[PDB]
Amino acid sequence: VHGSLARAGKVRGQTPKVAKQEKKKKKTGRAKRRMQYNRRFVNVVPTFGKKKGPNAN
């Protein structure tokens, strides 16, 4: 069939629950802007590649 009215919540009920694991907390407020001003602007990147964005792989 083509999912008539039952199996609502089909894909969420059968996904595996990988646990949200933990790391040290992120900086908040003023300190958050410090740790990302330095990441973008004071660190000139010596390598090229058409200047890929921050969430690269």
Partner: protein, 141 residues
């Protein structure tokens, strides 16, 4: 052409007021039949009781069943159909609960591929829908 002389402010101002009755978003806000027609009666939310789970079928390129309900309202009671805007959340609503239906996003017009639904359900049974989806709150015992 138009009127331009220092004496025609009666003709100009009377020609503007009757030609304002020809766009919709003035006329639906000033003629009063359109607020005696929407089931919210000129409001943003309305509580109502759930009569029937009903699944409408999606529009022309898509193919899925959009999970909806058949809310009848408690203020000036009228029949509406309302969307359940989340993944498993048809299961949290049961028969003859009370739900706070909201608008659906673009002012009395159906959004997306759902054919002719105008409303979405939030806060079934005085706990939130996002609280039920995220495991914050539950149904009563």
């Amino acid at each position: 052409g138009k009127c331009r002389g220092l004496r025609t402010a009666r003709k100009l101002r009377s020609h503007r007021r009757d030609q304002k009755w020809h766009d919709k978003q003035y006329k639906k806000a000033h003629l009063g039949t359109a607020l005696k027609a929407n089931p919210f009666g000129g409001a943003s939310h309305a509580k109502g009781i759930v009569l029937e789970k009903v699944g409408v079928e999606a529009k022309q390129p898509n193919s899925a069943i959009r999970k909806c309900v058949r809310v009848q309202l408690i203020k000036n009671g009228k029949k509406i159909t309302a969307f359940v805007p989340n993944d498993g959340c048809l299961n949290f609503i049961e028969e003859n609960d009370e739900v706070l239906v909201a608008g659906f996003g673009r002012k009395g017009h159906a959004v997306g591929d759902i054919p002719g639904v105008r409303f979405k359900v939030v806060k079934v049974a005085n706990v939130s829908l996002l609280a039920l989806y995220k495991g914050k709150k539950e149904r009563p015992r």
